[PDB]
């Protein structure tokens, strides 16, 4: 049993082999640009539907349409240029942790501590929202899901694996297993190629949906990761963690290029996403407000100061025209 | 102005209206987290109350609605979804008197009675505790003192002063002893006697909770 | 899904008479219901509408005060009671399922109907074209001209087109002037601007020919058009 010490010499050897290629750190790149300055975001609409908390949210690719999940035992799809309600789906188990809006808005996903991701289907005849399939085989509490097409799903269980869903013949076809701890985000690239996962163990995972092999390893955080969000281009990622730090990450360079923390946050992160053109940061906190860090800079350019409690889920529309914050208060925001 | 969006505000108010009465609906509920250590006498008072991740229990005693959540059966890092359970009304944690000489587990199930009796969360919720198996108790210390558990006992080896001290040392683990109860019941298995002691606390705790809404308290 | 009819048959005017609408194959609770007369000599015209949960009713002005329309939930029925009836009310009267959301397909299906007989500020649309024949895999093109600005302010031109075949109830085809309905082949097409409205059909064949009809939905009463007929 002496591989162990070959594991340390591989890992030693990756350390050397991405410590050569640090040429220079983000930060000295970045310095002779402008920042943005400082950026006033108000609540253009607020979404007052929902009892109890919420633990997550998805804006549809038309960016107009979210669905919004909480503990009450609803799944709200709410219009948000009108602040109408669309649907309210009761589900089978008040227990949710997650949400997802199909690409093509047909469908919906929902999952949470009965280790079930219910798809809902929507556009159908009969007028009512009904449930399309129920998704079994994690032992563990889903912590995301997120849809490839309407044909496939991936989800991230509190069983330290990701898994690739068939939705019509309800079997796994593809199984990541690489993790230690609990998966507790997920982020599908912009190709719907390869996604990543946030553990527990403090490291994220760079995945191949195709083949099901974990490509690069990216280590650094100090405590559990809680989000995770693909930069645009599809090359880079920011990881949420309970350290109240956020970093972000390169596919190419297999490193972290800059640390977004400040010496006043000291509360954690439960929610990250990028600006369109990938320039500002949200980035939710235990602190009952979001933070835009500048991903360039590393420098704050604004807080988003509205909810009475934790906001546990956050998200920017695929045209970028606003940022929804859904808090534990039970109200979902809409800024801009 | 509203054209055709006059009965799709109609349709939402509709629905606000759904999910307000669901929401009451809901309100009347009482929910109780179920904990517990391994093989505790949780599926005994499952059991006693008629009514795969986790498992939930819905019965009724004197017009109120007990909802009663087995979590035990999702093993995973427990900080992760403890935070879902806030607002709970209260917690029946099981105990097992005949597991004080197995395999220290009833120093593992006063570790765990610790660490989620002191929880940032759970601050305030108000335990119901649970002694179950006490035949076996009465059986056993008649030939296994109650040193081998805790090995400082200085009293007498009958069923009435070890009893007493397993209960005081259970109930000397909340430090803020000022702010949450723990009732405790010997799990008897006769005229549904737990169901009324669990209704009693019940009621005791959503007294408590109108006179904090009040103000009173 | 399914709608049925029941309370037509010869009627002595000044009388009264209740037409029901049995919905079994959705959730009736969720749908808003119109009642549509097509009298035998002309084309559809609307007459009644009833919210999702009744919360809401409204008549056309021919018939307002006469009738009266209400719903079943429970029973998933809806009625339509009609008092002091006239010679001019011998039509035969479509049930009609509608629903309203952002996105949804309002006047979807359309019940067989009843044909009841008797014996004996609202936006006009013209269509030109009473009638044109045609052959199979020719392009056709069928032109509406409302009278009021349909863009409402939200971008929103609500403009539908319906397809009555011959002896069979109308099926919506295009709703709000550009969106197909569900099952409608790719085929149809519609566009347009306020006022001009164009419906297209590419490789057009058999079984498609009929009445083509052009509804508005900006502001009640709800207004047909006269009906470009197709034949072969």
């Known amino acids: 049993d002496q591989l162990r010490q070959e594991a340390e010499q591989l890992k030693n050897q990756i350390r050397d082999a991405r410590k050569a290629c640090a040429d220079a750190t983000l930060s000295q790149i970045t310095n002779n640009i402008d920042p943005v300055g400082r950026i006033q975001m108000r609540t253009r609409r607020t979404l007052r539907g929902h009892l109890a908390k919420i633990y997550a949210m998805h804006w549809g690719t038309d960016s107009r349409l979210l669905v919004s999940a909480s503990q009450d035992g609803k799944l709200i799809i709410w219009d948000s240029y009108t602040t109408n309600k669309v649907h309210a789906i009761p589900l089978r188990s008040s227990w949710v942790m997650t949400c997802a809006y199909a690409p093509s808005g047909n469908y919906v996903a929902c999952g949470g501590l009965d280790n079930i991701c219910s798809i809902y289907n929507l556009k159908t005849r009969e007028g009512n929202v009904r449930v399309s399939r129920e998704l079994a085989g994690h032992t563990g509490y889903l912590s995301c899901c997120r849809f490839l097409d309407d044909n496939q799903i991936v989800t991230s269980s509190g069983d330290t694996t990701c898994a690739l869903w068939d939705i019509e013949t309800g079997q796994q076809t593809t199984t990541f297993t690489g993790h230690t701890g609990d998966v507790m985000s997920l982020s599908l690239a912009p190709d719907t190629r390869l996604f990543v996962s946030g553990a527990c163990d403090a490291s994220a995972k760079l995945w191949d949906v195709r083949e099901g092999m974990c490509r690069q390893t990216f280590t650094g955080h100090e405590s559990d990761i809680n989000a995770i969000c693909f930069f645009p281009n599809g090359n880079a990622f920011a990881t949420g963690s309970d350290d109240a730090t956020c970093r972000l990450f390169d596919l190419r360079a297999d490193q972290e290029l800059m640390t977004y923390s400040h010496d006043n946050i000291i509360c954690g992160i439960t929610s990250v996403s990028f600006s369109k053109s990938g320039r500002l940061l949200l980035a939710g906190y235990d602190d009952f407000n979001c933070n835009v860090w500048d991903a360039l800079k590393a420098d704050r350019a604004g807080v988003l100061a509205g909810h009475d409690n934790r906001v546990s889920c956050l998200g920017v529309t695929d045209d970028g025209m606003a940022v929804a914050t859904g808090s534990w208060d039970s109200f979902l925001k809409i800024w801009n | 102005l509203s054209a055709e969006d006059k009965a799709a505000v109609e349709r939402s108010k509709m629905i606000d209206r759904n999910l307000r009465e669901d929401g009451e609906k809901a309100a009347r509920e009482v929910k109780l987290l179920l904990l517990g250590a391994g093989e505790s006498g949780k599926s005994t008072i499952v059991k006693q109350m008629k009514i795969t991740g986790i498992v939930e229990t819905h019965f009724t005693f004197k017009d109120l609605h007990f909802k009663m959540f087995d979590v035990g059966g999702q093993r995973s890092e427990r900080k992760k979804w403890i935070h879902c359970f806030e607002g709970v009304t209260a917690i029946i944690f099981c105990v097992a008197l005949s597991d004080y000489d197995l395999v220290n587990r009833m120093h593992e199930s006063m570790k765990l009675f610790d660490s989620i009796c002191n929880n940032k969360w759970f601050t305030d919720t108000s335990i119901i505790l649970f002694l179950n198996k006490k035949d076996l108790f009465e059986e056993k210390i008649k030939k296994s003192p109650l040193t081998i558990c805790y090995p400082e006992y200085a009293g007498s080896n009958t069923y009435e002063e070890a009893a007493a001290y397993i209960q005081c040392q259970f109930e000397d683990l909340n430090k803020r002893k000022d702010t949450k109860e723990i009732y405790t019941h010997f799990t008897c298995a006769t005229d549904t006697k737990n169901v009324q002691f669990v209704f009693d606390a019940v009621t005791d705790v959503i007294i408590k909770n109108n006179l904090k809404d009040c103000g009173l308290f | 899904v399914q709608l049925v009819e029941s309370g037509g048959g010869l009627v002595q005017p000044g009388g009264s008479r209740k037409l029901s609408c049995s919905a079994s194959?959705?959730?009736?609770?969720?749908?808003?219901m119109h009642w549509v007369r097509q009298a035998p000599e002309k084309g559809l015209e609307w007459v009644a509408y009833?919210?999702?949960?009744?919360?809401?009713?409204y008549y056309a002005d021919t018939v307002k005060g006469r009738f009266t329309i209400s719903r079943d939930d429970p029973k998933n029925t809806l009625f339509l009671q009609m008092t002091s009836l006239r010679s001019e009310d011998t039509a035969m009267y479509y049930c009609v399922r509608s629903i309203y959301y952002y996105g949804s397909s309002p006047f979807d299906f359309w019940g067989q109907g009843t044909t009841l007989t008797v014996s004996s500020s609202d936006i006009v649309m013209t269509q030109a074209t009473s009638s044109v024949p045609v052959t199979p895999g020719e392009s056709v093109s069928i032109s509406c001209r409302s009278s009021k600005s349909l863009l409402h302010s939200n971008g929103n031109t609500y403009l539908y087109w319906f397809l009555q075949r011959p002896g069979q109830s109308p099926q919506l085809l295009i709703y709000?002037?550009?969106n197909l309905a569900s099952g409608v082949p790719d085929r149809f097409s519609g566009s347009g601007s306020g006022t001009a409205f164009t419906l297209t059909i590419s490789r057009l064949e058999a079984e498609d020919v009929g009445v083509y009809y052009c509804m508005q939905h900006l502001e009640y009463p709800l207004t047909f058009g006269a009906g470009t007929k197709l034949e072969l």
């Open positions: 194959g959705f959730a009736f609770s969720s749908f808003g």
């Open positions: 709000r002037m550009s």
């Open positions: 009833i919210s999702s949960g009744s919360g809401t009713i």
